[PDB]
Amino acid sequence: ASLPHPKIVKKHTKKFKRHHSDRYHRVAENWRKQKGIDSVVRRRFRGNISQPKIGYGSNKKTKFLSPSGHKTFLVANVKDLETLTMHTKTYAAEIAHNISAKNRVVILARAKALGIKVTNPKGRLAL
Amino acid sequence: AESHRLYVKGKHLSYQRSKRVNNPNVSLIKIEGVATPQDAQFYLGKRIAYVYRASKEVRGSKIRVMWGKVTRTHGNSGVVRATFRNNLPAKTFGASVRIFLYPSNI
Amino acid sequence: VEPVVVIDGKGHLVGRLASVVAKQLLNGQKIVVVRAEELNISGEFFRNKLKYHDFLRKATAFNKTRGPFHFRAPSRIFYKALRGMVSHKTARGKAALERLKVFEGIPPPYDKKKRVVVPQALRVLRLKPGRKYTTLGKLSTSVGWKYEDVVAKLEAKRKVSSAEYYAKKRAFTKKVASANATAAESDVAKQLAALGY
Amino acid sequence: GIDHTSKQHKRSGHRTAPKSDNVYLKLLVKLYTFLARRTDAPFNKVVLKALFLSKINRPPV
Amino acid sequence: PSKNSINRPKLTSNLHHKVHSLNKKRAQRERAGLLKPARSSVNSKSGEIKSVALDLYFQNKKNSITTRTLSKKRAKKIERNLKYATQRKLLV
Amino acid sequence: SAQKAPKWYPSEDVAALKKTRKAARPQKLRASLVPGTVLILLAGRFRGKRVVYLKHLEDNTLLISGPFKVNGVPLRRVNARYVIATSTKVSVEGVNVEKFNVEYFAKEIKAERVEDQKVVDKALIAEIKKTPLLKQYLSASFSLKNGDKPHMLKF
RNA sequence: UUGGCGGAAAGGCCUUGGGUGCUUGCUGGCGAAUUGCAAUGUCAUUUUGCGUGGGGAUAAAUCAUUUGUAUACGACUUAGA
RNA sequence: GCCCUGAAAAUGGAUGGCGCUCAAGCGUGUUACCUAUACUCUACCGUCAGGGUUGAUGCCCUGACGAGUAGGCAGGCGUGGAGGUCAGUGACGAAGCCUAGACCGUAAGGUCGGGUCGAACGGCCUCUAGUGCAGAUCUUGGUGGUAGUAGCAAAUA
RNA sequence: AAGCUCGUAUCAGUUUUAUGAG
RNA sequence: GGAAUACUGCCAGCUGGGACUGAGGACUGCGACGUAAGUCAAGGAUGCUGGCAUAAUGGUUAUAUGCCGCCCGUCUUGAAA
RNA sequence: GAAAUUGUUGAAAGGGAAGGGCAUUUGAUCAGACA
Ligand SMILES: [Mg+2]
Ligand SMILES: [Mg+2]
Ligand SMILES: [Mg+2]
Ligand SMILES: [Mg+2]
Ligand SMILES: [Mg+2]
Ligand SMILES: [Mg+2]
Ligand SMILES: [Mg+2]
Ligand SMILES: [Mg+2]
Ligand SMILES: [Mg+2]
Ligand SMILES: [Mg+2]
Ligand SMILES: [Mg+2]
Ligand SMILES: [Mg+2]
Ligand SMILES: [Mg+2]
Ligand SMILES: [Mg+2]
Ligand SMILES: [Mg+2]
Question: Coiled-coil stretches, from where to where (chain D)?
């Protein structure tokens, strides 16, 4: 129940991992550019990791879209939720991580009444 | 009768490759009885199945299929090129495939 | 077109036979080579013996048991030729090499099976007449193989048995051909001839 | 590969916009942008250009 | 193959044995019931909250060696939250 | 607020599609597919069977019959790209197949199917009996033998 | 079931007699459908599992102790109901 | 013209290997074939340029481009604290931490679920800085392999 | 990188013609 | 003497098979077939049909296979050396 | 109550290193969309 869109294409689904993060624990996976003058990764020798660049940018008509076709909007309460009352086909609400279960019940009831899709309706509400 | 076959036997030779890089998206297929590219032009567009076995049953069968189709001839000796929905696993270099007679132009 | 192809190595040239067999194994065909002692290498016997003594020169200096291993038998000479043409340190190469068996003579069960030839590796089809050539059994004997006489005696015994078998088969062929001739004048045979049989 | 005869990705520039954050100046720039687009009058072109100039380039009269 | 026995397959025999062994072990684990059921199974948790603590609490309410234990702190919190949910269900 | 509301929103009005210039013109069958031709089925339940082609339908499918008395294939639809047309043809002028169409075959035993099967099969048998060995040929199944080459085989 | 032969890794080849099924060598009569227009559409030997059962056979090795033809330790080589 | 000799040391080894003799050698001619981040066409990203337009540093149309060290310009990501706001989140569980689970960004990063935990903390517009680490025989603390290892044999028991 | 100009303006690791050298 | 054929070139001649792609999203334009109303392959794909409806496609993760991949940083032309 | 480092359990791989890239098989595991 979203707005129709082209089939979503991702040019690079794999995570861009920092070089030697597999080799050292002290080197995290968060991407860093190799600045070394003799670096084979910087110089783009065959058989090394791929580096992020703008040619991997996704289609502007499918960018920021979930597989169902909605953009995610973080909501903290019912007033935040009701900002999506007219944008039902284009936005889906995600309840913030620090909302209690008692308020999540109220948010879910209001969302069902308004027809607004909720991305994470199972959180903190195990039956 | 003793035989029920409706396909031609084939061998998965390798991926498309140069001397030091391969292309897994294209397989090279050797069809039995085909020795020239003009002979292999009959088989262009034909459906191919790699039919294999697994121990775990899925949807009522232990026999699994990877589907594909013949696209173009390759070289002078009757080899063809093929593309499958999922690329062939490279452990099947030298394994058997079935080339069916459909879609048919006869 | 067979599940197993039995190749009679007599009269074949080692390198061209090894090339075709290596390619067949990599494409996924089971091959049994028999009679490796009757294979041929082009060139004169002293040339080929000199080449084998060059191979015998090669060895690891600090420990001879780590070195190149010099197998003297004709089947092992052909196997070395073939393994040089197979990428044998990969799993695919090992799996290809495990589709091949090489024998001196024709041991059971292959002695009662059909044996084929490879025309692109045959000496009488490839070598220009008058060119000298070596035979693998004599080469192996000169470099240290010790079972040429045993294989020769067993081959003689096998030939006697196979000759008796062929005599019986030939007599039966004559009988079947005779009885098939007298049915060639019937209407069924005329219709078969009209269709090409 | 192409043998370029000129520089790639070169900016024309010519001071497209004013560097001020004055709301009234931005309103006047909007008005004279409309006029210079919809009249084809060189006076409006000159006024729109002079609205973009810096202080050292706008001396008093 | 080995250099000491060229006519005997080695890698293929090892691979055949390994495939058979892995298949036997997978069948044994499935029969022991250590694998998840189908997605449409009644006892499938697909699409629902997956929680060791809640599984243990509900198993103890339903009434080998494991590393899944439920602390009394979390159990009391589960009891309190379930009473909250029950009060809501009554009031609705 | 967990997130600021965006200033601009996409409109929720669904656009119409453009007018398409793609007309449906009738399928041109292969030159070898003529009514009365014996066909070899390449796929399906009756794969390898030899049937008789009767009529071209409006959904680009071929109506065929066994006939059902000969090899047990009823009046069916097949796809034209999943059969091999042979050189053998039986005379079809005595068969009335004006009733059979998409609505006839829609599934949303009827004995209307059975009676129509018998009505077609009578004239089919009458014509089939004229050519020697034709009934045995239609009852036997097709398969590839060792060394058969479909690129060189004549049908 | 009768007989003969095969040791190169024989493990197979040939043969006697009767029994029991099929035979498309030829002529007939019934059946097939709905897997819905394709989806490998599953077809071939062996089975360290079990239940039925009629038959066959009721061992060793190691530790510990012990010898010194052996020995850094292992190992080796002896002995003991 | 081709062939042989026309000098060679010293671990075992090399037309890359196998090997090849009417060649798989040498000279030449004719075709076919294989495949680069190159060339042609299409889509997508960004940059630049030219236009149109009474959320206008936005929208739409069109064309062409994209190597890069020192260096330069621009747009962004994250952190401690400050002013304003969301009458924001929170004992029906803040922050932190763990996670074979989910999603968005080219990326810096962001977001959600589960577990643990127990009292506070965020989004946005701005202000401010002791604001981002793999290295410095860096500093302080903690911990491995080496390893149940070397050894614990002077002074008679 | 900024301004003032001009924009059939300013030209060009090229040829041509004429005229030198070799 | 009279033909043919090769070779090379041209056709706004006809026609069979295969592969990849389907961007755009009311209309507007240039055209074509028709006396005409209209129609079309003419400023970018539609029509008809089946199966499944869940781990089936897909993702993640542990690995296997084919091919590729030397250890970073610094400093010196340059560095496995 | 993090990491280095360690124990147990479960799963896996291993014929003189391991790690990484593209692609797919296998096993495990998982979300969305379900009128
Ligand atoms: Mg370029
Ligand atoms: Mg070569
Ligand atoms: Mg030549
Ligand atoms: Mg918390
Ligand atoms: Mg600092
Ligand atoms: Mg550090
Ligand atoms: Mg550094
Ligand atoms: Mg240090
Ligand atoms: Mg220290
Ligand atoms: Mg000690
Ligand atoms: Mg002392
Ligand atoms: Mg998959
Ligand atoms: Mg390499
Ligand atoms: Mg504590
Ligand atoms: Mg740890």
Answer: none
